[PDB]
């Protein structure tokens, strides 16, 4: 019952799997911009070229019990800075390149990813806009605690993101 519903309320149907990011000790963070990053994926590849859909995202990390670290996943409606399946990399993870500090990032719906007790987390968010039929929201995954491990172990910890759209009206 770790399902996190955003803001308390709720061949097209299938599980889309994005690329697996390599997350190392010296890394910073990654972010995806929905729907735009998903428009090139699968059935939506030829579909995008109005849309009303809810989004169910799953963030899973496969790591052994010998590592340590923590991530933070969140959903920020209308995230504007101040992109393909590769996403991008934040050059200033403290301000998230928004000029907005990282400590207050938890105001938005979030779930804590801790390599100790939990290997996976998910966030169910609905469609939120002033106009019902239309860069809706970005997905921010940044480590709070950097990775530390003894020599001889695996230096890269894969992070996968699977998108499962629910209640899609095109």
């Amino acid at each position: 019952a770790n399902i996190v519903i955003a803001y308390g309320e709720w061949s097209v149907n299938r599980f889309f799997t994005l690329d697996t990011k390599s997350w190392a000790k010296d890394s910073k963070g990654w972010y995806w911009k929905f729907p735009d990053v998903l428009t090139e994926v699968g059935v939506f590849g030829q579909n995008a070229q109005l849309y009303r859909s809810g989004f169910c995202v799953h963030v899973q990390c496969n790591a052994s019990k010998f590592h340590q670290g923590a991530l933070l996943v969140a959903v920020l409606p209308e995230y504007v800075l101040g992109p393909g399946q590769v996403g991008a990399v934040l050059t200033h993870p403290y301000v998230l390149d928004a000029g907005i500090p990282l400590s207050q990032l938890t105001v938005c719906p979030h779930q804590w990813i801790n390599l100790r007790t939990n290997n996976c987390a998910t966030i169910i968010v609905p469609y939120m806009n002033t106009v019902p039929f239309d860069c809706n929201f970005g997905l921010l995954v940044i480590p709070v605690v950097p990775l530390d491990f003894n020599a001889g172990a695996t230096s890269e910890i894969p992070i996968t993101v699977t998108i499962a759209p629910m209640c899609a009206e095109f």
């Binding site: 409606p77 209308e78 301000v95 928004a98 907005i100 500090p101 939120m128």
Partner: peptide, 8 residues
């Protein structure tokens, strides 16, 4: 949609 404040 409450958002985090801007420190900078």
């Amino acid at each position: 949609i409450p958002r985090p404040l801007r420190n900078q």
